[PDB]
Every structure is written in structure tokens, then in C-alpha cells.
Amino acid sequence: AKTEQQIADIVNRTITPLMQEQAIPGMAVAIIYEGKPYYFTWGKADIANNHPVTQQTLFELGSVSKTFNGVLGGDAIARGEIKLSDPVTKYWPELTGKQWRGISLLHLATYTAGGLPLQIPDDITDKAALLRFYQNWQPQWTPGAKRLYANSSIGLFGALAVKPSGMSYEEAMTRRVLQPLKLAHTWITVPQSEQKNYAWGYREGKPVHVSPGQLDAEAYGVKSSVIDMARWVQANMDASHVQEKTLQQGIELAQSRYWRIGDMYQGLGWEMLNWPLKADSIINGSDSKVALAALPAVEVNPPVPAVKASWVHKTGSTGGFGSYVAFVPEKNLGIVMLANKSYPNPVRVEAAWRILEKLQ
Numbered sequence: 410a411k412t413e414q415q416i417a418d419i420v421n422r423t424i425t426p427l428m429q430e431q432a433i434p435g436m437a438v439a440i441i442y443e444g445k446p447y448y449f450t451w452g453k454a455d456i457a458n459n460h461p462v463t464q465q466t467l468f469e470l471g472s473v474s475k476t477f478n479g480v481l482g483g484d485a486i487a488r489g490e491i492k493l494s495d496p497v498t499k500y501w502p503e504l505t506g507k508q509w510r511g512i513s514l515l516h517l518a519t520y521t522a523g524g525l526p527l528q529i530p531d532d533i534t535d536k537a538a539l540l541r542f543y544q545n546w547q548p549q550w551t552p553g554a555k556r557l558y559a560n561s562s563i564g565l566f567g568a569l570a571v572k573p574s575g576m577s578y579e580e581a582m583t584r585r586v587l588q589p590l591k592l593a594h595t596w597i598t599v600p601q602s603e604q605k606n607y608a609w610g611y612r613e614g615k616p617v618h619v620s621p622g623q624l625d626a627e628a629y630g631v632k633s634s635v636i637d638m639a640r641w642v643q644a645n646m647d648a649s650h651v652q653e654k655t656l657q658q659g660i661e662l663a664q665s666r667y668w669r670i671g672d673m674y675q676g677l678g679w680e681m682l683n684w685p686l687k688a689d690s691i692i693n694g695s696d697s698k699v700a701l702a703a704l705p706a707v708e709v710n711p712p713v714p715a716v717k718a719s720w721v722h723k724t725g726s727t728g729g730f731g732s733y734v735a736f737v738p739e740k741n742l743g744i745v746m747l748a749n750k751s752y753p754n755p756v757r758v759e760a761a762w763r764i765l766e767k768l769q
Contacts, residue, residue: 411768416440416447419767427760428452431752433731434611435462439639441646441736441743442768446639454608454749457616465594467607467632468747469619471725472560473732474631476645476663477586478567479678481578482518483659484585490573493518493667500569506544511552517566519667519675521706524549525562529623539623549703556670556706563678564624578626589653590644594634597626607632608749610729619727629727638734638745645679645721646736646743664715668706674713675706681719684737688762695724695754724758726751733757735765742768 411419420438428436428451435452450462485491491500493515498504500514508523516522525546533539543565549557571581579597587595599607609616619630633641644651644660651657666674666681672690674681682690693699715738722735731751735758736743744761 411442413447416442416768417449420449420764423760423764424449424451427756428748431748431750431756433748433750433752435466435608435749437462437464437466437468437635437745437747439635439642439743439745440764440768441639441642441741444643444647444741446636446643448635448639450635454606455616456609456611462608462749463606464636465606465634467594467596467599467603467634468732468749469610469727469730470631470633470638470732470747471629471727471730473723473725473734474626474629475563475678475725476641476723476734477582477631477678478563478570478627479518479663479676480645480656480659481582481586482514482566482570482677483662484655485570485574485659486662487655487658491570497565497569500572501543503540504543506546508546508548513552514566514569515667516552517562517569518677519706520556520558520562521553521668521675522548522562523552523554524557524703525559525565527557527559527561527701529561529564533623553706553708555703556668556675557703558701560624560628564628567627568624582626585656589656590640590651592633592637592640595637595641596632597630599632606634610727611750612729617729619729629725633747635745635747638747642734642736642743642745646738646741661715664719664721665712666709666716667712669709670704670706674709674719676715676721679721679723681716681721683716684718684720684739686720688759688766691720691722691762692755692758695758697754700724700754722758724754726754731757733761735761737765740769
């Protein structure tokens, strides 16, 4: 049984050189070891004003926001509000295009709709334009044939998933996920009172914050602290302690395996690989050459319920931030790596692997 100081030594040995080599101003890392949280912070959250990273520093999670999306969707399924088999047109009747027939909420959630684009076009700045965009989108492949990671896909899933609730995505997320899990330092919109804790992201040494964009909250707009992310990992790793029934069930549903792409399985937001595994699979898999590629999707029907012997993870980036979260339910082991500089995904994964390999 490792002591907090022994874990600290392991973490620092990897993070110190990482920050120096990648020129990362500040980082916050959470380690879940034997189900218990351990926090670590380094550097600056704000260079110009010389403010350090603290346990309350808020980092832009980028696409790790998709895991919150998936869980909220799972919760909606558990509430009987939506079904993954429901057609997209049930929630957005205005999508009359014939190309939308046969496309389900599952397809949107798992990037298997047929090639929806990675990004929603920048020229789209209003609801009307967003409708035209989806209406005129032409599928590149038939539903379920290929997986193409895309913000426009899961972003739409999140927006439609909360429609029956009658709440906005932000309100639904806050009331159904953030508050029940006591994530008091997790936000889609950082309030004025918490701006003092909002770290600046850095690109080319310049401070920057993510700009507003269509379906941003749903795909890449959540901000959170190291303490809240440790709680998020614990809740997703083992939801047996989660009191709210539909949330507990929603968490489990987000880790069901809906498709197999090579050796990776697609959940709702979360991505999974069988455990044990070898470093190359996840490191190489995180390179954009693989992560952003259009690959054949093999349907898992019926979906396989959450497998404890899995490496569950998600990468996330914005212009000024780079994040990574990974956990292994079988081992009650996990890690959160938050940084206020975006750096190569494979570098993040390799660092996480070296650390957890020493905490087996």
C-alpha cells in the first residue's frame, strides 16, 4: 500500500520533466489509488499575474466534456425520456431530409451517423443556420458503417437528449449530474465569482480562453477543477455509491460497448479498451492519424454492459488546454491530467501510462 508521499514521488518524476519539455505553464493531476483521491498541482494558472495552480483552479476540459454529455444522455435513457434506438427526427422533426431516415440517437452519440463533420462550420452562428447545416448535410456512408469522431455528431446528441426534460443542456447537466455528484467547481459557464480560479490557457505563450461556438457545451465546453475531476473519475469508475438511481444507471450506460473499432470500444463519450493492455495500443490510438480517421465500425448488438476489466479514457483539447482522464475499474485505479497548454495526445497518454504502471 503506497503512502501519499510515495505516490507523490511517482507522479512528480513524470510530470516535472513533462512540464519542462512541453513548456506547460501549469498542471493539476489527480490520482485515484485503491479508490482514494490524491491531488497534485504545479506551476502557474496565470503567468502575467503570477497566480499558482491550486486545487480550485478551473481548466478547460475540451472533449472530456463528451463524457459528461454521455452520462447525461445515459441518465435520460434511465429516466425513460429517450431511447438510443429513437430516430433523430423524433426529437428534431424539422430534419425532413431523406438522408436522415434510419439515423438514430445512438448514431449521433457514437459518431456512426455517416460522416457528420469534426467541426460545425464556423460560419454557423445562429439556430436557423444550424438547421440548414444539418438539413443539407450529405452522408458519406450508410448509418452504422463507419465511425468518424465529430463534435457535430455527439454535440447534436446532447442537445436532443435533454429536450424531453424541458431544460436547457446547461440546466439539465447542472441539476442531474453536477449537483448530485457535488461537482461544485465544474461549469459550462464560469460565473463571475469563480473567474479568479479560471486559469488562462496558453498557445504560443499567449493567454487564451475558448470562444463561444455552436453546441460547444455539449462537445468541448466544460471547465473543471482537479478535485471535481477526481470525483468524476471515482463516480464513473464505480457508481455503486451514487445515490440517484438514474444517474447511477446513466453512468453505467455510458460505458456499455456499442461498437468495436479495432481494439477500441465506443461508449457514450467514454472510449474503452480491454484490460490488461500494452502501452502502444492507447498511445498510438491517440495520435490524430487514428483518432480522427474514418474507420469501419463493428456493431455490438446488443451492447455489452460496462466491462470492469477495461481501460476507460478520454482526451480533450481547446486552443489553450490539454486534458486526459483514464481509469481501470478492475483495479480501482485512475488518473486526471489537466494542463493549461495543449500538447500532443500521445505524450499525454504515454505519461499517464508510465505513472499508472508504477501504481499497479
